[PDB]
Amino acid sequence: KYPITDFEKYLQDITKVRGPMSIDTFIKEVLTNPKYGYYMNKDVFGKGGDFITAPEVSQLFGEMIGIWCVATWEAMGKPKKLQIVEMGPGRGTLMKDILRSTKVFKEFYDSISVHLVEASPANKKTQKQNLLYFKDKAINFDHKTIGETPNGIKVTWVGKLEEVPTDIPTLFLAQEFFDALPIHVFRFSREKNDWCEVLVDEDITEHGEYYLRFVQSKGPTLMTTAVKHLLPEFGLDGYQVELGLAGLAISQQIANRIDKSGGAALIIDYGYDKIVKSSLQAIRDHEFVDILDKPGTADLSVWVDFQTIRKTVKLLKNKSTAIGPVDQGIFLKEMGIEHRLAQIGRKLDSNEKFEELVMGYKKLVDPKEMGTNYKVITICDKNITPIGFSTSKTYDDEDLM
């Protein structure tokens, strides 16, 4: 027990006026509320980024993704203009490593411009400071949405993917992005013989524990009905699933963009090649805590359902498709990470630096590290073979027929 927080008050009040809220709405509020959001106005807490992401683990990761960008661009016939779009670029580390390591490929480097999709002003500032060359002393990062890299590469920031120019071949990079998108949660009731949505309501029950609680909707919600075609038919009592509808919508935007103007997307995240039953987690100061324990004070995340993304793209029945998830270890090895590891190791002269490099490699590719939990899926043109997906599976049930 603890005193009720202001943002818990605020959330309770939403449930009083509009009824229990979907988990999607709950997550949106918790992360991105102007006054109380976790992602918004707080920062300065854990590490300097808090959690180490794949790019921050090793330059190897960024270099392998750069090689993927170049190889893909070649496979698309070396367009004179290529957009590279990143969803949620973090500190800009991945993009920085790409732009460094791909400089050597002149023809490629001459064709690229960069577009970063970023909602957080804090993140925009960090990314700009990390990526741009500045001529002026006084910088207001808000009225500075276009910039130039020290190598002269153009970089533009926008709030939504919708704002990115169309009608130009485009690469899309989404690294640890989908795990941070909101989700809906549904639960099958056999005694109602139908699906219900799981909602967050105020909790005023004696010995309730927190000021919010999870409840089940009285029958199907509008969303339940709207997505019943995605839920499993084998409804067992209490059987529960998570659905990343926001992610599916983004996937459709990317797929249709690729269908119209060409391109390819790499989506890298921790997740499964199946529907995820339960994975929503809340971390605070590097400790797992209850989702409803001081909402807004903890980072929420989900394991990505790669299967539903794949099926959703395929169901567009256009020139796009999604070549199914392959493990990060397998992907990075297939991109030539071991050769690069050897080359960098040889240029290094320090034993300590070499040991660091190898530790990073192992963290990226070992099965007991990120190598298996993290997975890679691509959205691309049916007629252009993806790079790094030789081990992707076939999925008969879902293919053309």
- DSSP calls for 369-398: TTTTTEEEEEEEETTSPPSS-TT----GGG
Amino acid, single-letter form, for residue 238:
G
* Cα–Cα distance for residue pair 100/351, rounded to 1 Å: 24
Instruction: Give the list of residues 6+ apart from residue 389 with CB closer than 8 angstroms, or none.
Output: 323, 326, 331, 334, 376, 378
Residue 283 near residue 301, CB atoms below 8 Å: yes
Structure tokens at 371: 């190598």
Residue 200 near residue 113, CB atoms below 8 Å: no
Structure tokens at 188: 């099958």
Rounded to 10 degrees, the C-alpha dihedral 245/376/56/145 comes to -50
Q: Please report the sign of the dihedral spanned by the C-alpha atoms of residue 275, residue 278, residue 279, residue 281.
A: positive
Side-chain-side CA neighbours of residue 252 (13 Å): 11
Instruction: Give the list of residues 6+ apart from residue 318 with CB closer than 8 angstroms, or none.
Output: 255, 256, 259
Find tokens 């089940």 and name the residue: 216
Instruction: Give the list of residues 6+ apart from residue 207 with CB closer than 8 angstroms, or none.
Output: none
* Cα–Cα distance for residue pair 374/393, rounded to 1 Å: 17
List the domain range (segments joined by +) for residue 78: 1-400
Residue 82 near residue 171, CB atoms below 8 Å: yes
Structural domains counted in the chain: 1
* Cα–Cα distance for residue pair 371/365, rounded to 1 Å: 4
Would you tell me how many other CB atoms lie within 10 Å of the CB of residue 332? 29
Structure tokens at 333: 């090895």
> Please, where are the H alpha helices in 132-215?
none
* Cα–Cα distance for residue pair 327/111, rounded to 1 Å: 30
* Cα–Cα distance for residue pair 312/253, rounded to 1 Å: 11
Residue 69: strand, helix, or coil:
helix
In order of 32, 132, 251, 265, 269, the CA distances from 181 in angstroms are 11, 27, 12, 17, 12
Per the DSSP assignment, residues forming a β-bridge with 113 are: 83
Torsion angles phi and psi, residue 163, rounded to 5? -75, -10
Find tokens 């993704």 and name the residue: 65
Structure tokens at 168: 């130009």
Among 273, 216, 213, 218, smallest CA distance to 240 is for 216
Structure tokens at 314: 């395929």
The full length of the chain comes to 401
**Which strands form 281-284's sheet, in the order they lie side by side?**
287-289, 281-284, 299-301
Torsion angles phi and psi, residue 36, rounded to 5? -110, -5
Instruction: Give the list of residues 6+ apart from residue 129 with CB closer than 8 angstroms, or none.
Output: none
